[PDB]
Amino acid sequence: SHMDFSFIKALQTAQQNFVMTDPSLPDNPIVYASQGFLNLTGYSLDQILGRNCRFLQGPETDPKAVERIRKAIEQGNDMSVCLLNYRVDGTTFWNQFFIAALRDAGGNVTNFVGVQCKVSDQYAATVTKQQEEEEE
Amino acid sequence: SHMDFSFIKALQTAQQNFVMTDPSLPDNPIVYASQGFLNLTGYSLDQILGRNCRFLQGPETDPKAVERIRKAIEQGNDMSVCLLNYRVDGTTFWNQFFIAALRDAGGNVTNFVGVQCKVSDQYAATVTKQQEEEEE
Numbered sequence: 001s002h003m004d005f006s007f008i009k010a011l012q013t014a015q016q017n018f019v020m021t022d023p024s025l026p027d028n029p030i031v032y033a034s035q036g037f038l039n040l041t042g043y044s045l046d047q048i049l050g051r052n053c054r055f056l057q058g059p060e061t062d063p064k065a066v067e068r069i070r071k072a073i074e075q076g077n078d079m080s081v082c083l084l085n086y087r088v089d090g091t092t093f094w095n096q097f098f099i100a101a102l103r104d105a106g107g108n109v110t111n112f113v114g115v116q117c118k119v120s121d122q123y124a125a126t127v128t129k130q131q132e133e134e135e136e
Numbered sequence: 137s138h139m140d141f142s143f144i145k146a147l148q149t150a151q152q153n154f155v156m157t158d159p160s161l162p163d164n165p166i167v168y169a170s171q172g173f174l175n176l177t178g179y180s181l182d183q184i185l186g187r188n189c190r191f192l193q194g195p196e197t198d199p200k201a202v203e204r205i206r207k208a209i210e211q212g213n214d215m216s217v218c219l220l221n222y223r224v225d226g227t228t229f230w231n232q233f234f235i236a237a238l239r240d241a242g243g244n245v246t247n248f249v250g251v252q253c254k255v256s257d258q259y260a261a262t263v264t265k266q267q268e269e270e271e272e
């Protein structure tokens with residue numbers, strides 16, 4: 001019914017790409033980020049907290065996927081999207097990332113959790129083909 | 137307020153280690169498992185669904201961690217535990233895995249989500265040191 005602190009501790013440490021964001025604060029900013037997340041994105045820790053993950057997007061990013069994400073966030077749905085993200089140095093990578101809407105015993109969204117997965121160009125091609133085939 | 141099907145689709149496919157279990161069914165069995173999960177554990181798909189993840193544990197698995205997990209499950213808490221797990225061939229590996237309690241708009245636990253991470257022996261040593269230092 002709550003959050004065991006083991007979750008929060010192993011999150012900041014896990015060599016994979018995890019993030020947690022707080023909807024209670026404005027703009028839903030990152031409160032905890034994994035070490036593998038900083039390895040993948042290349043950012044320092046001070047450039048992560050207090051900000052929303054929009055800084056991973058850029059020019060060549062599919063805005064339909066971004067609208068999908070923001071709709072699922074406004075409704076608090078658990079989703080997953082593959083899109084092109086940018087590191088700090090400007091390099092690009094295909095991020096297939098998940099979003100979970102953790103809710104308390106009252107049904108209210110307490111925190112958002114995000115798992116990012118770097119996928120190859122073949123997986124990106126197939127999943128983008130499906131997502132673009134999802135036309136209305 | 138619901139589960140976007142993108143979550144379920146990208147779960148079964150993601151090359152990482154994800155699982156989802158249904159508390160509505162007896163013993164809380166696995167309903168969806170990732171491809172990377174089958175790569176890590178070595179099991180076929182038919183040996184996964186309809187079963188609880190106890191088949192990953194074994195002889196030299198810390199039972200205190202298992203009691204911790206089952207208490208957090210009975211209370212529906214989001215946790216994370218590092219423990220020794222076994223593959224199908226009998227080989228061992230240190231699994232630092234997370235557990236999230238997805239709840240609906242009414243606060244009831246709908247499904248459990250689990251992310252497994254294979255960690256080295258140094259990380260296992262440090263985290264097991266902390267968890268054993270957690271004595272009452």
Ligand SMILES: Cc1cc2nc3c(=O)[nH]c(=O)nc-3n(C[C@H](O)[C@H](O)[C@H](O)COP(=O)(O)O)c2cc1C
Pocket residue numbers: 019020021028052053054056057066067069070073083085095097099112113114115116
């Ligand atoms: C927990 C969480 C993790 C997210 N991770 C990413 C990410 O890794 N890459 C990305 O492009 N967007 C990510 N997003 C989405 C953005 O943070 C943002 O919500 C998205 O751009 C839609 O919001 P907007 O329409 O206001 O721009 C994540 C969102 C959440 C809640």
Ligand SMILES: Cc1cc2nc3c(=O)[nH]c(=O)nc-3n(C[C@H](O)[C@H](O)[C@H](O)COP(=O)(O)O)c2cc1C
Pocket residue numbers: 155156157164188189190192193202203205206209219221231233235248249250251252
């Ligand atoms: C979603 C989910 C994923 C789990 N993944 C693992 C796992 O990877 N390895 C493991 O040893 N136990 C895992 N467990 C815990 C076991 O499934 C089981 O709940 C645990 O042994 C405690 O239950 P018990 O006291 O009845 O044995 C997971 C549990 C859940 C709910």
Ligand SMILES: [Cl-]
Pocket residue numbers: 141144
């Ligand atoms: Cl379905």
Ligand SMILES: [Cl-]
Pocket residue numbers: 227228229
């Ligand atoms: Cl091994």
Ligand SMILES: [Cl-]
Pocket residue numbers: 256257258
């Ligand atoms: Cl090692």
